[PDB]
């Protein structure tokens, strides 16, 4: 492309997708943190869902948002992580690698993908 373009020429580079998965690798220093106000634990029985963000942060950079819910990081699952340790546990690793998901990008959809749309099988006349 010219700009940093994908739909310029064809396509431009290549990528793969597979799932609405997002890894969000964040590289730390030395006092640095993700600013981000998570919620829920194991404590409680919940995921872990953000509802805040820093003005001016690692996370707010990448791309994070509240509403977003973080499946792992640093290869951990943070499915069943306490509350108190899901906050330590970000703001203690260098390498914080936050893989979201999209949660909330359409409204209700069902069939809102097909070339084809619905194909035809067993045939046989053709005359009329």
Do not use: C, M
């Amino acid at each position: 492309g010219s700009s940093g373009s994908s739909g310029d020429r064809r396509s431009t580079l290549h990528l793969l997708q597979g799932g609405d998965e997002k890894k969000v690798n964040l590289v730390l220093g030395d006092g640095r943190s993700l600013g981000l106000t998570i919620r829920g634990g194991a404590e409680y029985g919940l995921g872990i869902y953000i509802t805040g963000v820093d003005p001016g942060s690692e996370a707010e950079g990448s791309g994070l948002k509240v509403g977003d819910q973080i499946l792992e990081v640093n290869g951990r699952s943070f499915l069943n992580i306490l509350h108190d340790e899901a906050v330590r546990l970000l703001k203690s690793s260098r390498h914080l690698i936050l893989t979201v998901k999209d949660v909330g990008r359409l409204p209700h959809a069902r069939t809102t993908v097909d070339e084809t749309k619905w194909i035809a099988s067993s045939s046989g006349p053709s005359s009329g």
